[PDB]
Symmetry: C9
């Protein structure tokens, strides 16, 4: 006993998992790489501490936009599954 | 037990759409973090730069985001207008 | 012999595993990259220790947010599976 | 109830998604890494802007060639599926 | 031909547990190698550091290993106490 | 209704997608990393601009060889599928 | 003709493959990155050759611990499969 | 509906061969790009080197390519002589 | 029509492919990263060639150990499949 939505919903959960698994790879590594520059810049140029946070937050904003746009589509896949029967 | 052809096709479409956007976010998050790493370091080294660094930064981010959003458009095709649906 | 929730739960477990596998890739590598800058920065200048831990912990907080938001959605997938019949 | 093209088209969509997911990982990260050198190079020496955009655009052209050759084969897989019955 | 519901659920649990630990080791191996890269370089540059480098090194490795072992705990949940088993 | 080649062909398209998805990850990131050195070298040593292109094209040639050998095997998988029935 | 353990065992081999495939990605890249620092440190500071091996082996030990703990769980999955019927 | 055992085995072989070569090209493309990055930078810094840099470059590329071609040989085994075919 | 070993062998081949795909990612990238330090080190100081090959070959030995231990378990999976019926 199966029904079509069992297979569609399984596909939706696997697809949603790929969306969020990739989002976290991009966000964790992209934010780490941005922070690496912030930390090194402050070590090299202490007086710049305050001004380095502006390009840092621009960068984190871009990185997090990918994470949260992915999250929104994961939510679509698993709560409003396109093609559900 | 009941399946139909579109149950399998739609499951494949969702998995494929998920691969498209999972890979898009890996490329966008890491590419934008690497571009921003250089912006931050460049401003730390040459604070007077700033102005001349944001043009190359925006060109780089534009290229990275183009991959993200072209992928997003094809994810949308896969899941809202699946090619090969029966 | 199968039933619809057997296939849905299998998809939920694979999807939850993708979510946490990607979370740990982003957290382990992003935290390592942040820490690389902290360690290098302190090596270059021992008196900067305090001032470097602040951007380090901001970076780690961002990286860990990805990890734990993913963990929450893994828990949703496997304990309150969206689409279970 | 299934037919052979249902399984073939499912495989084509998964395969097309792998092609484009890998294309974007290579394009986003390769373009980011190229741009990192462009930005750093201009920071070090503002008068080098023109001369650095030339190798940058050569690099981006190579990276984008991978992306768009992959995109063409994704289109082959999902619109003119090889092996469709 | 005989399957039962738990055959499918347990196969999904094992694949999911494998993803959890495969990703955990990718993050732990590369994160710990990157942390150690800085420890090694820092000692090459400032051999008298040593002492002051091991505290940031251990904090970094502790964070990386926390991801590895939290993942391991959920792999164990997935395969020894599978949620949703019938 | 299925037939054996439906499953074989689905496998071939997924395998071909893995081959090209991995090829583009390797090519986009490898070419970006090669170009990063080209751009930085020209920034550091402008007079070397012309001579840096020789090791650059050797490197890109190696990277692209992996991409195109993969492409050839993807073509084999999906147009001349080994094991087709 | 299938039986439940055929599907469980297939899942166990795929899960074991993911465990060891991820372990080798982490170990090969983590050890390479550790060795990069060892080689560069010796190039920069020849007299330090002997003392750099201590932090190097600490680092490799951590990296290999992930590899071999993964190996042990792969062995569990494929030789003492949890949930086997 | 008709399947036979080799349809499933051959589908697994093709997916497995694809993983082998997808991973081979990831390792070869990025490893060769990283090796070449050092060759290019080394020649930028020490143009008179050149000669002494190509031996370590070729040893490194030889190691990277060995992984690529050993993988290729096993992909060929998987898909042209599948172990376990019935 | 199927039999249990058809599904087990399919899982073994996918699992063996994961093992070798991950082995080559770790070996190619880890060896490239080691070699990057060797090449840079010799560029900086040609007389250090001999002394840099020693840590290079230690690093490569570690990286290759991951590759070949994985290769051995791939061979176990596909030639002496654990759980074959
Ligand atoms: C939706 C796309 C948003 C991209 C980020 C843009 C944020 C604003 O970027 C601005 O650009 C200026 C150049 O005129 C810089 O000098 C400023 O520091 C910066 O705030
Ligand atoms: C969630 C994980 C956080 C771990 C925090 C461990 C405590 C680190 O604490 C740090 O110790 C330094 C001395 O080494 C001080 O100079 C810093 O100000 C302090 O933040
Ligand atoms: C879950 C996200 C955790 C990270 C949020 C951290 C926000 C920190 O905010 C920052 O604090 C700095 C302290 O010096 C200031 O210099 C900056 O101006 C300020 O933006
Ligand atoms: C396909 C994406 C290409 C984007 C190109 C954007 C235009 C960049 O144009 C660049 O502007 C520089 C000044 O900032 C000039 O010095 C360079 O010569 C010029 O190429
Ligand atoms: C799709 C591939 C796009 C990249 C192809 C770029 C080929 C550029 O070719 C290069 O042009 C340089 C310009 O200074 C010259 O210095 C080099 O000698 C020449 O090889
Ligand atoms: C199980 C966790 C093991 C983590 C590695 C710890 C190995 C011992 O680490 C020791 O720490 C000292 C600080 O007191 C350093 O000065 C020594 O060089 C080091 O041997
Ligand atoms: C099939 C394997 C091809 C590997 C690339 C080799 C390309 C030729 O490499 C040559 O090696 C010389 C050393 O004698 C270098 O000095 C030259 O710059 C280079 O052209
Ligand atoms: C398993 C792959 C190992 C390849 C080893 C190739 C031989 C490299 O041999 C190296 O040659 C150098 C000169 O270039 C010598 O200075 C080194 O001492 C020597 O180890
Ligand atoms: C399969 C694993 C291969 C790598 C094992 C290499 C062990 C080398 O051992 C090292 O040899 C060095 C030579 O200078 C010494 O300086 C170190 O003290 C010693 O620990």
């Amino acid at each position: 006993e199966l029904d079509p939505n069992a297979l569609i919903t399984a596909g939706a959960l696997i697809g949603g998992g790929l969306i969020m698994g990739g989002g976290a790879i991009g966000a964790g590594i992209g934010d780490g790489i941005a922070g690496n520059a912030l930390i090194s810049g402050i070590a090299r140029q202490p007086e710049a501490q305050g001004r380095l946070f502006t390009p840092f937050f621009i960068t984190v904003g871009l990185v997090e936009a990918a994470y949260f746009i992915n999250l929104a589509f994961m939510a679509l896949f698993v709560f409003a599954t396109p093609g559900l029967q």
